[PDB]
Design a protein around this ligand. Structure first.
Ligand code: STE
Ligand code: STE
Ligand code: STE
Ligand code: MYR
Ligand code: MYR
Lengths: 249, 45, 240, 292, 292, 240, 45, 292, 240
């Protein structure tokens, strides 16, 4: 009737071991599933390259600092140029997949801090601008902020999630904390959420992956200053339809 | 004697609001975890 | 012609009238309904999700720092860490909560609340806190001796990093008005004060000031009534 | 017969959770108070397990907090001025159908990411002096692709296929039922993507977040007139969302909106919570303590 | 089927108590006339036991003296002037909902201490010259806590959640059903207490008797207009109390009211009974006596 | 369109029309109905409660003294103590009664009345009174010999301190109009006169003047009809 | 043939007045005493 | 009873054809791709037999593409000006009933050669300033052969046998059901012939294509007046074609119409397809190719 | 008079309201319905009929020549014969088709398309063509090597003179909007390019340039939605 602190996540040829894990958040209680015949609309037979694309891709490592605001990734965009997933995402017009997001941040028992690892469906990034005409560039975020790639994007205003919504209510989304005294990893299994059965992996980013320090990383002199935060994600039940020439963006 | 929830048009979307199917399933937002944790139990043991 | 007599309320447009209206599109079959994960059918299900209380809503405190209750090693005993009123719809820490924002779309609320405090210090940081809920009629307790006379929990920091303080539904009326202030302090819910039961003890070479994150939510018996319009965002011109 | 269906049409009261009677607990291993918020799960602690509770057979109705009751309320979604006086002698106006132009409806909708619903659109039209002289108006729905009218006399007003409502200002507000019109399974108040492929390297980047699955055409309104009427008509559009299906609840918007189709907040970020003097100051005076 | 329910919908006549035939009684120990009013009980003496009565099969209907029939009558509860001319170019008015502003409704309500009821509110609006030109009004119910409008154009009139009625003056009186809206089990026309804790040592003491369980918000009325209409609209609010449950009957008010929310009578106390010349003088002349 | 024809009475607002109207609050469940003691469902139940008749409604008499019928030791025999008309809605002693005030909310009344006289003298004060109800057609009896020809009770003061005089429903019509005066003396109920059957005898060192308190109410066969608006309190301006 | 007391709305409080439950229980106001006193009996014996 | 009929009155959804799952085919003699368009038959090739398809349980509703739903929409068929001002003080107008005067209705009808239908004719009448003052109009149907009125007072308005509708401008639009009135089994939007025998050697040849089976008389409209009203009334006639039976589908008209009763296109023939630069140029930019 | 209350939408004339109206002719029996060949009850049945695509919609090309895809003997290999977008309602080759004109009376379409190419050269003219459908996201393929990565058919000229290329319903949404251009390129269907798989080989004394006639139609799973008004013919004055 409890959650075991040890966990092993084996997907494909990738395996993730954690010895200080809180639990595994199954987003909205729904495992990732393949598109049923009732919900499908595209007639082409989808490709399900099970083990070549459904596997853990360690994508980015961000150095947690005392004044760090946080980072966000867009799930399809963060894997669109990586591995056989990226190739299928480029060669195919349609794509659907869940994911198993695994954020890793280990620190000594003398460090402190708390990250909020949340998976935000349809994470539309806002721009912070003064009162200006709709002609103004500052009213709308550039592409580097909407699709940060694999490197992610440092939050400008994590208090409002760079979306005008309060960070305090970001816990309405499938979330997990990395409290350094408690756990060093946060696992979120997110099913494919979209008003469409399939969608373009290049145009549309289904989920945002926010890692925001709520309690700032504090430690004493002599502790290891560099405390990294690693994002390992794994597609789950990846389908691809609409084969054509490979399209980058 | 109630005489309501009557559709006068052949299109079903012309009907009144569907106000008779109150369902409350908060577990998908409140306990979205794989390991079900008992209340009396220490969660991380 | 069937004899009829028009009654008052004829020709009125009541914005909350669940009635029929002619369909603009004969024979329109919409796009099929596919399964989308995360359907919510009740706003009470959303109110039970714990969201961060903005307890450090003080002048100077900006950004995510407003979500932290600072806890440090005390030089004296029986001291006050933080306090906040537990009126969900009152301008204060509960504004940052999903329950405190959905409450504002309703006039009257009822049921127990729940604040889960998460300690975000070092593993080596130990401490015991007395988190007391003071039912109405009393101001904020001036001493821990006065606060421990109300509904309280003595929280011990440890492997489990979070404690839940239920604010029990202690009310004279079945519902409390979401509006507060003035004569509407009749519907005051109370005050939650966090006291140092013991000190915040740390070994050497360990941070001496940590943070408690408060997570407010609604209990299973929570209920809202009389949907109204919130007073959270105002508009002076149509968004173009 | 079907008289059993008409009998069970009134809303039945679903009550809140009863509180069971609880006694004191003095032991080990049973810690219903200790939680782990890191797990992403809300606390399962009950009132019975933290205090000595009584038996409360709760009869408070939770039925009003449903998504249907929260949304099935006609709110303002559009104000369309049919200018026919002064410099604008048009007598018609083609209005882009968007429900995100007014804060009260917009903030309620953005509670959810996806919403699939039918709507009851009501048109409350009148002059500037609030008067409603008998003046024939034509409210034509121009779906995406249908030719938009360019005058008050143009051929598009023949509405051979377009839905159109003819109603005088003196008539009660025209009210029609609109189905779920969308190529998608649900509307999408937040679309983290771009409608078209490309590089998206423009200085403005106007196309981010613009999902055409929500763009449901235009509402063309005209005075059925042969010349200028000299009177401007203000058509207020009220949408009542019925048959609601909401998905992926979101944080309610905290910053003031700045534009219609984009989340865009000021550089002056407003705190979600109002500031107080100190973290230990509450402004509840209570009563006079018996013995301080 | 349910046609049996529609058959027994007319009001059945409940008759008054029949009088039994009684004869003379000459004995001891049987004293139906002697009572003890000190016991706090009304006399149980019957007409049969004090005079020789006949058999009267009484068929007088007592059904009209019910609390429902006594209260289910629309009386004036509010007069709201929507001033839009002269010095007050507001075009809107936010009216504190109180049913104790007019003597006829107030005195009937104060017969009972607690009343739990639904209401049928009717709005009879017109100009000063009694005319009802087609003029669009918005009657928005602003529950306690909802933002009150501060102009005729303010955002609160979007009524996305607030109940609102749009009706022209030319329309028949808008009529709506209001439920029992109160945090308490019943409304409380007399609240022997204070809403808040404290010392209550103010020179005025305005908070005595003020129970917020009865304060049910405001009725915001506006002309749906873009500028001043130059016309003041008088909205008369009529409340018909239905589904009545009354508790603790009280003496009917004898002194003239002076204020809305407080029992406060003049220092010139009016006697409940009009004065006569002497305790032995009755002004009934009758007929000419046969033999004086 | 179903063929209908609007009839007269269309668009009218009848203040006494028990009809339906659209609910402003969809799905509103009110606060639960708990048991409150003292529920009254009929105004006739209130009219049967005995309330003090203001029989001493004379000039100079102020306050609670207007509720007392003075009785004293008489120097002569067969004297008149007090008289009052038994028209419930007439301006007079019955205004102070609950029956006399609820009668004024109705146009026509019917049924027997009841006046319970309570003697509030010393235990040592003895006396016999003749309380006579004179049916209509006769003025107030000038002598006890004339009053004893009507419905009367000879009241003996003693351990039981109260007597009940039923005013029987002696009327030509099934109902009497609550309005009196003028041609509406057709609905006169009669006159109740209190006579000294014997004297008011007291021993030495005992008060020689006592009070009788009259308590008027309605019998079980009492009935009201045609609800109207009372003429008891007038208003010249909205109470602000 | 009576066709009334019909609710046209899903909310029960939109119905007409409840005018079919005339109940008269005056004893709670007229005889609110513990010792029931017979009419023929002297009350204080 | 017949309550079963009222239950099955809502439109049932007929879905599109499902796609079956298909695998690869490597053999001879089975050529589902090779067709012979010379046979005049459309290709029977299915998606399953040309590509590897999946199982798509199609739930798209095809019910809206029916001839009933395509035609049962009120479109403008006539604009009749009741001139009563200036040089035309007639107060009446006799309008030849023809549904081929306006492009939107005409092009939809000419999709079929023969159409047999009932109609719901609606009359939306108003003044030039779009206002609808209470003004009594008489819409009399004058079938072929019935005497046409020659004034506003003439005897034909007695309408002892002619169908006539009296309605003020202030009334909602008069709406009537017209049966299938035709000597033929169906109306005929294209009549390759002449109504009369003869030589047909006129320089104009006005009678080609004129089938009197479609000429259904006149609509005589008058103001019920005794003298000139000084106001011109514009009556817009809207026909909703119901109970439709269509035969012999035709190519939709591509050239702009020039006259009412004749197919007659300009010498400047407009291409059905818009011109592009080259047969190998498509203006779809797509995305950035991964490796060109 | 039966009590009724008029609701919003009263007195409105909705042009798409399937309601009753009084018959102008009492007892009218129409002309009997005789059988006429060629009754169509669904516009989808018309959309499945193959009609000539106007693929040669180029400047200078006039008349029936706009319906021909010219094919000739090539001096180089892997060349492009013709290309056209497969958006049925887009201004282009599909305007000349019955499916492309009935699509314009609807807002959203769905289902597979079908283009049957008929080779109208000499019996002695042989050739193989690669007709490729490129799903959305890609521009027109610049080489046959890039086009063969999409849905394609290698057509061999022979006794059967026609090939069918199904444009499969490859879409993210269940329906595509008939409107194209701008942000509505989100609903782009793709591009069909005709490539010379091999050359167009003819013997001596044989025409070296032939024509391919494209015949576009809709597959059996084709579906239209949201009837609207087409934008194909405009009118500035009532046809007199
Ligand atoms: C005769 C007049 C009929 C009125 C037709 C109204 C059609 C309304 C469309 C449905 C509204 C909901 C979809 C709005 C989504 C747009 C918001 C956005 O994402 O910017
Ligand atoms: C759309 C307009 C709707 C009108 C809403 C009316 C709401 C009325 C509230 C119910 C009235 C009874 C409670 C009044 C109690 C106040 C009296 C007092 O104690 O001072
Ligand atoms: C009271 C007013 C009633 C209106 C009567 C309308 C009668 C309409 C006739 C039916 C319309 C369809 C037939 C039109 C055919 C003429 C077109 C043509 O071939 O030129
Ligand atoms: C016109 C007649 C409509 C009849 C509709 C059925 C109403 C049944 C009456 C009982 C109400 C249902 C709740 C109950 O059982 O008490
Ligand atoms: C539309 C039909 C409604 C029928 C309602 C039932 C009426 C029954 C008729 C008898 C009236 C009841 C009193 C009686 O039994 O005489």
């Amino acid at each position: 009737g409890y959650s075991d602190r040890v966990a092993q996540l084996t997907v494909g040829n990738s395996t993730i071991t954690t010895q200080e894990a809180a639990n595994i958040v199954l987003s909205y209680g729904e495992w990732p599933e393949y598109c049923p015949s009732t919900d499908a609309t595209a007639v082409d037979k989808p490709t399900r390259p099970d083990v070549s694309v459904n596997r853990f891709y360690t994508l980015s490592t961000k150095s947690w600092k005392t004044e760090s605001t946080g980072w966000y990734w867009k799930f399809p965009d963060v894997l669109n140029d990586t591995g056989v997933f990226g190739q299928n995402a480029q060669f195919h017009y349609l794509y659907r997949s869940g994911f198993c997001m695994h954020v890793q941040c280990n620190a000594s028992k003398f460090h402190q801090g708390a990250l909020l690892v949340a998976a935000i469906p349809e994470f539309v990034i806002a721009a912070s601008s003064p009162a200006t005409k709709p002609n103004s560039q500052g009213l709308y975020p550039d592409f580097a902020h909407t699709n940060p790639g694999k490197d992610g994007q440092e939050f400008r205003d994590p208090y409002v999630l760079d979306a005008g919504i309060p960070l305090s209510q970001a816990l309405i989304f499938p979330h997990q904390w990395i409290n350094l005294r408690t756990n060093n990893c946060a696992t979120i299994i997110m099913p494919y959420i979209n008003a469409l059965p399939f969608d373009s992996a290049l145009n549309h980013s289904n989920f945002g992956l926010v890692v925001i320090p709520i309690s700032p990383l504090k430690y004493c002199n002599g502790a290891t200053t560099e405390v990294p935060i690693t994002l390992t994600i794994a597609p789950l039940n990846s389908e691809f339809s609409g084969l054509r020439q490979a399209i980058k963006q | 004697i109630n005489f309501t929830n009557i559709n006068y048009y052949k299109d079903s979307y012309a009907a009144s609001a569907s106000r008779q199917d109150f369902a409350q399933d908060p577990a998908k937002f409140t306990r979205p975890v794989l390991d079900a944790i008992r209340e009396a139990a220490a969660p991380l043991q | 012609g069937f004899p009829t007599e028009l009654k008052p309320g004829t020709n009125q447009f009541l914005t909350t009238d669940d009635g029929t209206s002619p369909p603009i599109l004969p024979g329109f079959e919409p796009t099929p309904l596919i399964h989308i994960p995360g359907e919510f059918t009740s706003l009470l299900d959303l109110c039970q999700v714990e969201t961060i209380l903005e307890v450090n809503n003080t002048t100077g405190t900006t950004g995510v720092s407003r979500l932290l209750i600072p806890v440090r090693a005390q030089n004296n005993v029986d001291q006050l860490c933080a306090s906040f009123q537990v009126d969900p719809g009152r301008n204060g820490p509960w504004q940052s909560t999903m329950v405190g924002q959905i409450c504002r779309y309703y006039t009257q609320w009822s049921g127990s609340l729940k604040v889960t405090f998460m300690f975000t210090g070092s593993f080596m940081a130990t401490g015991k806190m007395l988190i007391a809920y003071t039912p109405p009629g009393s101001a904020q307790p001036t001493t821990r001796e006065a606060a421990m006379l109300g509904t309280h929990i003595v929280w011990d920091f440890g492997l489990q990093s979070s404690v839940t303080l239920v604010i029990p539904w202690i009310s004279n009326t079945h519902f409390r008005a979401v509006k507060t202030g003035g004569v509407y302090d009749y519907y005051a819910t109370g005050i939650v004060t966090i006291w140092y039961q013991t000190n915040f003890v740390v070994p050497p070479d360990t941070p001496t000031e940590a943070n408690i994150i408060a997570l407010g939510a609604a209990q299973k018996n929570f209920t809202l009534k009389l949907c109204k319009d919130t007073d959270e965002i105002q508009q002076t011109a149509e968004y173009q | 017969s079907a008289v059993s269906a008409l009998a069970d049409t009134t809303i039945s009261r679903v009550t809140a959770a009863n509180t069971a009677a609880s006694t004191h607990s003095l032991g080990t291993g049973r810690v219903p108070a200790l939680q782990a918020a890191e797990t992403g799960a809300s606390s399962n602690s009950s009132d019975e397990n933290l205090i000595e509770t009584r038996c409360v057979m709760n009869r408070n109705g939770v039925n009003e907090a449903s998504v249907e009751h929260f949304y099935s309320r006609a709110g303002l979604v559009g104000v369309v001025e049919v200018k026919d006086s002064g410099t604008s002698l048009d007598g018609y106006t083609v209005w882009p159908i968007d429900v995100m132009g007014f804060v009260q409806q917009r903030r309620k909708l953005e509670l959810s990411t996806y919403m699939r619903f039918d709507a009851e659109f009501t048109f409350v039209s009148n002059l500037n002096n609030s008067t409603t002289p008998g003046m024939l108006l034509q409210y034509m729905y121009v779906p995406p692709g249908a030719p938009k009218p360019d005058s008050r006399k143009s051929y598009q007003w023949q509405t051979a296929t377009n839905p159109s409502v003819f109603a005088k200002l003196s008539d009660p507000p025209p009210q029609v039922s609109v189905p779920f019109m969308s190529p998608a399974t649900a509307y999408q108040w937040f679309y983290d993507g771009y409608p078209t492929f490309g590089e998206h390297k423009q200085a403005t980047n106007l196309q981010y977040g613009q999902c055409p699955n929500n763009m449901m055409g235009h509402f063309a309104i005209r005075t059925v007139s042969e010349s200028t009427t000299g009177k401007n008509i203000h058509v207020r559009v009220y949408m009542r969302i019925k048959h609601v299906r909401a998905w992926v609840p979101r944080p309610l918007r905290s910053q003031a909106y700045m534009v219609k189709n984009y989340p865009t907040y000021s550089q002056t970020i407003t705190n979600t919570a109002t500031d107080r003097a100190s973290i230990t100051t509450t402004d509840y005076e209570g009563g006079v303590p018996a013995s301080p």
